[PDB]
Each structure stands twice: as C-alpha cells, then as structure tokens.
Amino acid sequence: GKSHGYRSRTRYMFQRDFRKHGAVHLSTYLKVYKVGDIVDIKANGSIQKGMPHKFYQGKTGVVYNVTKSSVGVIINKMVGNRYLEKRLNLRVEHIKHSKCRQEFLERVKANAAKRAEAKAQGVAVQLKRQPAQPRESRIVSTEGNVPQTLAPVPYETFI
Amino acid sequence: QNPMRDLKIEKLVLNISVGESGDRLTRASKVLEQLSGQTPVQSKARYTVRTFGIRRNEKIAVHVTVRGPKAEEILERGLKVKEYQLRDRNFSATGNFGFGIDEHIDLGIKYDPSIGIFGMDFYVVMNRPGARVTRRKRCKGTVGNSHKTTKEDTVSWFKQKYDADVLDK
C-alpha cells in the first residue's frame, strides 16, 4: 500500500543545516510574536513537538493566536477551487519573522517623514515607488578608455 | 624548574580478575578490602565471550583505586617484591605504568584461613597537578602539550624515586 504518512517525502525538508545541528540558538525563543505579525514557516528537525506539515514549510501567514509555547498561524491553502484558512498551532521554533513586514514598516515610516517634509517645504516628494526607469542619455568619453577591438577567437579544443 | 610542574601519583588501581562469581569473589573482595582500607567495586562482565565461563553481567572482577598517602605507601609495598625495578615495557604512552603481581595474601599480610589465593594488577595513574582542568565540571578545559606526561618523563621520575631502573631483561 502506498504511503502518504504525515512526514512522507521529508528526507530533506527537515535536514538541519550543515554544521548547524544540535540545539538551536536562543533568539528564536527570545523574539516576540504579537497578533497580526506575518511570519514564515521554516520547520526545525530537532524539535519534534509542534512540527508543521511538510506543505507549510516555507509558507507565510499572520499570527491569529499566541500561546504558552506556540503561536497560531493562518495560512491560505489552495485545495480544490479555492483557498482555505489553515490554522496551525506551531511551536515557536519552526517560525520566524518575515522581513517583508520590517521593510514595509520602515518604508512606511520613511514615507511618513517624506509626507511631513512635503507638508512643510518641497511638495510632491514622489511618495510612490518607481520601477527601474530606462537609463537617461549620457556622454561616454574616451581618455585612456580608447575603444579596443574584440575579435571572435578561433575554436581550440584544449582536450 | 617549577614548584608544581612535576609528576605525581593520583591513583593506583588494583585489579583482581576472578574467573567466576561467589565465595571466591567475596574472598577477593575482602582481601583487597583490608589491603586498601576501603571496599572495592565489582566489575560486571561487559559481554559474554562463550569461551571463558563468563556471561555478561556476572561479576567477574574486583578492582579498587587508592589516592594519596595510601597509594604512595602501597606502591612502595608493591615494589618491595618487584625488586624496585621494571622493564622498558609496562610504561604506557600516556605516562601511566603497571605491573601484575601473582600473590599478596601471604606476601604482605598474614595468610588467614578461608581466603584462598589471589594475584593482582597494580596500575599507577601517573601525572602532574593541574589535570583537574580536564575533569572539573565548569570550564572543562584540556591540558597542554608541556603539562602532558610521557614515558620518558615517567622513567626519569621513576629513576628519581624508588632507586629504580628500567629494562630488567
């Protein structure tokens, strides 16, 4: 009979990183997880209790619950024709803050500072992000940087 | 050279390997008991060998360790029949050294009745003060190259004491 057990096909998912076996460092317990923070799931092989399913490895969702030694994480799971609120009860070893919040929050603070300065001097400080616009015209000069030719080289076997 | 970089006799282990268990085992235990002033421990067989009349966990040995003045005096007493000399062999590469006497019960004490006969191995654990650095719990360090004990160091020390020589053969 074909096996679809809880930790099927998990030969490499829970491999502790090379030269990173043993007890995990203590910042993972010393972090704080308030409700509404969005965190990803990097399962830890060493700790057994609270292990997620292999499907949630690498996913990311908000924390809906904070517990004695664990948090409750909401993940969207694509099954059938629509997503579902999968609610995990994860020991705090297998989670860690997703830095997307950190970058978004610091961009929000910087944007608010930009809005304040525009509220004082220099309006239209271009609040939105702008993608990598095409490079505007430039002069490329030729002192010491004389154009030296490059010719295609003959095929040498080198075997 | 240095007041406390010289070798010392931490512990002398005395071993009596009894063939079987029982009254003979108790005899070895009692005799080594009055010899060392302390009760030895029973060394249960590790695995059954099937050729020695010995099954695992069958109490086939009796050994005790001695440290301090008791160890010093009992080493003197051991060598008093070893002729205060040994061989180039019997010296371990780590510094320790040993020798097995064939009898003590009438050799050093009165041969009482109901004791039988017994021979024992002396094995001197020979090193220098400061080796607690590897056996203590907190900050369990490791000794350095110089503080290590070698066979040439131990043979020099064994010349310096006991009026001893090496390579009896």
Partner: protein, 58 residues
C-alpha cells in the same frame, strides 16, 4: 478492464474557469481557537469598554 488510476490533466483549467478566489478576510475575524484565557479577558474588557464609553456619552 484496466481502468486508469490518476490524472491531473485539465484540473487546473477547471480550477481557473470560475477562478481561484481569496477567502475574503473580514475585520474582526472569528475568535475561534484563539487562547480561551485571552478570550474571556476580551469578554470582560469589551463589556467594560462599552459601559465606559456609553456612560461617558450619556
């Protein structure tokens, strides 16, 4: 006789015809499975909050 076993063909197109839809998250989501110790604190807290606000507004 021999009937075929499994096939994912056309299933993604079936899933994308009516379109895979988000669950439409709401303000004040369901307080299900959140810590009960926190739940009943929240209970007494909201009771008191509505009391204080309405009493202040008279």
């Amino acid at each position: 006789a021999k009937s075929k076993n499994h096939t994912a063909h056309n299933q993604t197109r079936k899933a994308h015809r009516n379109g895979i839809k988000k669950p439409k998250t709401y303000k004040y989501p369901s307080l299900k499975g959140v810590d009960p110790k926190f739940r009943r604190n929240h209970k007494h807290a909201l009771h008191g909050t509505a009391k204080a606000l309405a009493a202040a507004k008279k």
